[PDB]
């Protein structure tokens, strides 16, 4: 198995968005627009995200970081349905923090305290923006 990149393409303008928010050890989080989606992500309130979703922050170089994750079939299937872009979620994927975002993870010793996915709705032109172009 490999870790495929979840590329920027998956964040389509106009549509709602799932924000990955990461709380490092220290206390002001780190916010990454994870995936644009047609409908909000609600999990069975029985369960929590950690059950289905595991992330690891590693350095990619002297100055950059990536976030790796492993997604269990349920969430995988759940995200793929919700996605605006055509079913882009594999079991093993990674995404690339930028030079800006990286600094934080480096300074935090890569040590994640907690994380969540969070639904962010659309803005005032959204409807018009998503249908245009």
- In total, the chain counts a number of residues equal to 133
**Which two three-digit tokens encode residue 49?**
């995200």
Give the Cα separation of 35 and 7 in Å (integer).
10
97 contacts 32 by C-beta, under 8 angstroms: yes
Nearest to 34 by CA among 86, 4, 79: 79
Q: Resolution (in Å) of the shown entry?
A: 3.3
Task: Extract the annotated binding site for GMP.
Answer: 56-58, 109
SS (H, E, C) the chain: CCCEECCHHHCCCCCCEEEEEEEECCCCCEEEEEEEECCCCCCCCCCCHHHHEEEEEEECCCCCEEEEEEECHHHHHHHHHHECCCCCCCCEEEEECCHHHHHHHHHCCCCEEEEEEEEECCCCCHHHHHHCC
Give the Cα separation of 47 and 58 in Å (integer).
27
Distance of CA 104 to the CA centre of its chain: 17
Task: Extract the annotated binding site.
Answer: 56-58, 109
Listed in sequence order, the residues at least 6 apart from 2 whose beta carbon sits closer than 8 Å to its beta carbon are: 92
Give the Cα separation of 92 and 128 in Å (integer).
35
Other residues' Cβ atoms within 10 Å of the Cβ of residue 56: 12
b/e sequence 8-38, b meaning 16+ C-beta within 10 Å: eebbbebbbbbebebebeeeebbebebbbbe
Residue with tokens 């409807």: 127
Give the Cα separation of 110 and 25 in Å (integer).
9
Give the Cα separation of 81 and 75 in Å (integer).
10
Residue with tokens 């793929």: 80
**Which two three-digit tokens encode residue 32?**
């990454």
Give the Cα separation of 114 and 111 in Å (integer).
9
CATH class of residue range 1-133: mainly beta
């Amino acid at each position: 198995h490999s870790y495929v990149e979840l590329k920027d393409k998956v964040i389509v303008p106009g549509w709602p968005t799932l924000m990955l928010e990461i709380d490092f050890v220290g206390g002001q989080f780190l916010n990454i627009p994870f995936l644009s989606v047609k409908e909000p992500l609600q999990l069975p309130a029985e369960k929590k995200l950690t059950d289905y979703f595991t992330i690891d922050v590693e350095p990619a170089g002297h100055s950059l970081v990536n976030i790796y994750f492993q997604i269990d079939d349920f969430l995988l299937l759940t995200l793929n349905s919700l996605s605006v872009y055509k079913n882009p979620i594999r079991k093993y994927m990674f995404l690339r923090l930028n030079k800006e975002q990286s600094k934080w993870a480096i300074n935090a010793a890569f040590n994640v305290f907690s994380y969540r996915l969070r639904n962010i709705g659309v803005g005032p032109l959204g409807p018009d923006i998503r249908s245009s172009g």
